[PDB]
Amino acid sequence: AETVSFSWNKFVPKQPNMILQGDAIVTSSGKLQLNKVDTPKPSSLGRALYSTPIHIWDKETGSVASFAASFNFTFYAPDTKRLADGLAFFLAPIDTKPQTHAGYLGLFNENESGDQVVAVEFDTFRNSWDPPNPHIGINVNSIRSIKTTSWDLANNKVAKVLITYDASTSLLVASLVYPSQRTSNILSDVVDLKTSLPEWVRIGFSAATGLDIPGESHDVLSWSFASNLPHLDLTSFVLHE
């Protein structure tokens, strides 16, 4: 089997194994700051991508990879009543570039069909296509999630996320936990990677502040990822990676 994995308890400035786009920068304090601040600046868009391409599925053997990703993130909203727009974990073509900001989370464009992009969003603003209240959603080539669930978020608190994909069942699972609040949310749905993503892809984060309002800033504090493409043990990744 073909496998890859990595784990960081923090980020380091100028680290050559990461690609930054938009307003994203890593602070000296080891934080991946996706949006500009001075309080969030409106219309800010930043994305970060793990430099090395991941082999998601193979056209020959036809086998698809299973993977797991976890990270700690937080947002700061100067006004918890006017939140916007959100954060997303995504997989996309190797040459992926930033797209439309605000409600499109920098992954899609209005009037166009999305590229081969798959993502798990943490949406804070209700756009026309959205359900009411902040939510977690699974996006498959569209900003219009195929499924969502309410997200009990907390301003300034660290959220711990775990995203897992089981190739055997094609099931994608996303769970979010707030240790300090002992609160938790989970979502799951089947996704077919063979028809929604190219064989090789890059993974990363994308976040956007309000279009005309500060909304909230987004910071990723740590990141862990493991993938196994067959010719798995998640308990070892949640306790290991």
Ligand X SMILES: *[C@@H]1O[C@H](CO)[C@@H](O[C@@H]2O[C@H](CO)[C@@H](O)[C@H](O)[C@H]2NC(C)=O)[C@H](O)[C@H]1NC(C)=O
Ligand Y SMILES: CC(=O)N[C@H]1[C@H](O[C@@H]2[C@@H](O[C@@H]3O[C@H](CO)[C@@H](O[C@@H]4O[C@H](CO)[C@H](O)[C@H](O)[C@H]4O)[C@H](O)[C@H]3NC(C)=O)[C@@H](O)[C@@H](CO)O[C@H]2O)O[C@H](CO)[C@@H](O[C@@H]2O[C@H](CO)[C@H](O)[C@H](O)[C@H]2O)[C@@H]1O
The contact set with ligand Y (CB under 6 A) reads: 84-85, 102-103, 125, 127, 132, 210-213
User: Shortest distance, CB of residue 237 to a second copy, whole angstroms?
Assistant: 3
Classify residue 168 as exposed, middle or buried by CB count within 10 Å of its CB (0-12, 13-18, 19+).
exposed
Which tokens is 5 given?
Answer: 């994995």
Per CB under 5 A, contacts with Ca ion among 101-140 are 103, 123, 125, 127, 130
Q: Which of ligand X, ligand Y, a second copy, none has residue 221 at its interface (CB below 5 to 8 Å by kind)?
A: ligand X
The residue among 107, 203, 88 whose CA lies nearest residue 151 is 88
Point out which span in 2-10, 70-78, 121-129, 149-157 binds Mn ion (CB under 5 A).
121-129
Per CB under 8 A, contacts with a second copy among 13-72 are 66-70
Residues within the interface to ligand X (CB under 6 A):
9-10, 29-31, 72, 158, 160, 169, 179, 221-222
> Which is nearer to ligand X, 92 or 136 (by Cβ)?
136
Q: How far apart are CA 58 and CA 148, in angstroms?
A: 29
Which tokens is 201 given?
Answer: 């892809």
Q: How far apart are CA 138 and CA 190, in angstroms?
A: 10
Q: Using the rule CB under 5 A, is 85 a contact of Mn ion?
A: no
Find all residues with CB under 8 Å of 20, minimum gap 6, and list them.
26, 46, 47, 48, 49
The correct pick among 85, 123, 199, 216 for binding Mn ion (CB under 5 A) is: 123
